[PDB]
Amino acid sequence: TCPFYKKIPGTGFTVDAFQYGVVEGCTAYFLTHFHSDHYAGLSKHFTFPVYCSEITGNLLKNKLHVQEQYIHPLPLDTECIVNGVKVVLLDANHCPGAVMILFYLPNGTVILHTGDFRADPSMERSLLADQKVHMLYLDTTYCSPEYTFPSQQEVIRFAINTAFEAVTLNPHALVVCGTYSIGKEKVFLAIADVLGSKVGMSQEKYKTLQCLNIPEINSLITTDMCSSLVHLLPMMQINFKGLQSHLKKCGGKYNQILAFRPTGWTHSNKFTRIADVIPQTKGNISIYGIPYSEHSSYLEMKRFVQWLKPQKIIPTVNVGTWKSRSTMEKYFREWKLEAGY
Ligand code: NI
């Protein structure tokens, strides 16, 4: 049945609650972003109002064939009225079109649902600074202090310099990047840009990127694999077998593959610095796992919450085990005592 942490008290609203059939008493279904665990259940046969960002609304229409009459896109940073309740969508710094949702309840409670986010100090200067938040529904994906990772900027720097060096040493090397959902486009776009290539991809993936309002996208991507030296493939194909296979398909145009797997966290982060990352190599194929995250590190999450000073926190991730729940509540208490709210 729909879990309580997907329901917004004092409204008829749910968030990211599309897989439970008809939720009893729900008058509006919000969707924070176009990732499958969140949209699971939507299709062309959905007949209730869906509230989301413009970009998420492009993907509902074009990829899932949801009917236009039921898509209600809202502009960001703008006070809007939904079934008599004031709401605002804010940028979540996750994947394209991902938002956080501020709800202003008739009784005077203010609720922030983060969706999926990577907390950033820039959020401290949005509409959030302007009033108090009583309840926070928080993306707790990496809520544990072992989860450190570099800035997105440092990771992109590493990837650009790596690719550029490899291709300039060997002009017959191909670069490949894995993907399984929207998000992390900076990885492959930044590499293509330094190499003066377009990124080549399947028709299904090109269609997906064409929904995302990226400026100058027609200049950066293509479905012609032959004219491109940066190829995107499913994440599943990023391994020695899948890459040898792909290399055979290119018909002796290339003699080396350099491949990137943008993982979330991996346990080499406890020890290793970004400077010090090394590939796994077999023959003429090298594979780099890089820690490009679109979720908050532990410290970024702690700073955001200690800044917001909410009265109650409701976790949305890692809630399935008692040991996880109990550990998270312990960190919430430390943060509160240390900051004095
Ligand atoms: Ni997500």
CA distance 243 to 241: 6
Q: What share of the chain is helix, strand, coil (3-state, %, to 5)?
A: 35, 20, 45
Residue 85's beta-bridge partner residues? 82
CATH number where 74 lies:
3.60.15.10
How long is the chain?
A: 341
* Claim to verify: residue 322 and residue 245 sit in the same structural domain: no
Cα of 36 to ligand 1 centre, how many Å? 8
Resolution (Å units): 1.9
* Claim to verify: residue 25 and residue 119 sit in the same structural domain: yes
For every residue of 47-94, DSSP letters joined together read: -S-EEEEHHHHHHHHHHS---GGGEEEE-TT--EEETTEEEEEEE-SS
* Claim to verify: residue 176 and residue 312 sit in the same structural domain: no
Cα of 280 to ligand 1 centre, how many Å? 28
* Token pair for 310: 């909410």
Print the domain residue range for 88. 1-147+296-341
Cα of 6 to ligand 1 centre, how many Å? 15
The experimental method, as deposited, was X-ray
* Claim to verify: residue 256 and residue 322 sit in the same structural domain: no
Cα of 33 to ligand 1 centre, how many Å? 7
**Alpha-carbon Rg for the chain in angstroms:** 22
CA distance 193 to 72: 35
For every residue of 238-276, DSSP letters joined together read: -SHHHHHHHHHHTTTS-SEEEEEEE-S--GGGTT--GGG
Q: Among 117, 133, 98, which residue's Cα sits nearest to residue 297?
A: 117
* Claim to verify: residue 193 and residue 253 sit in the same structural domain: yes
Cα of 172 to ligand 1 centre, how many Å? 36
Cα of 251 to ligand 1 centre, how many Å? 37
Cα of 341 to ligand 1 centre, how many Å? 30
CA distance 200 to 232: 6
Q: Is 236 helix (H, G, I), strand (E, B) or coil?
A: helix
* Claim to verify: residue 183 and residue 283 sit in the same structural domain: yes
Count up the domains in the chain and report the number: 2
Q: What's CA 40's distance to the chain center, in Å?
A: 16
Cα of 184 to ligand 1 centre, how many Å? 11
* Claim to verify: residue 29 and residue 90 sit in the same structural domain: yes
Cα of 70 to ligand 1 centre, how many Å? 23
Helix residue ranges per DSSP H, the chain = 36-39, 54-63, 152-169, 185-195, 203-210, 240-249, 298-308, 322-339
CA distance 24 to 325: 27
Domain boundary among 295, 317, 333: 295
* Claim to verify: residue 307 and residue 213 sit in the same structural domain: no
Cα of 38 to ligand 1 centre, how many Å? 7
Cα of 183 to ligand 1 centre, how many Å? 8
* Claim to verify: residue 291 and residue 314 sit in the same structural domain: no
Q: Residue type for 48, please?
A: F
* Claim to verify: residue 25 and residue 133 sit in the same structural domain: yes
CA distance 240 to 257: 10
Q: For the chain, what is the largest distance between any 2 Cα atoms, rounded to a whole number of angstroms?
A: 68
* Claim to verify: residue 127 and residue 247 sit in the same structural domain: no
CATH number where 283 lies:
3.40.50.12650
Domain boundary among 280, 295, 310: 295
CA distance 21 to 92: 27
* Token pair for 330: 């312990």
* Claim to verify: residue 316 and residue 196 sit in the same structural domain: no
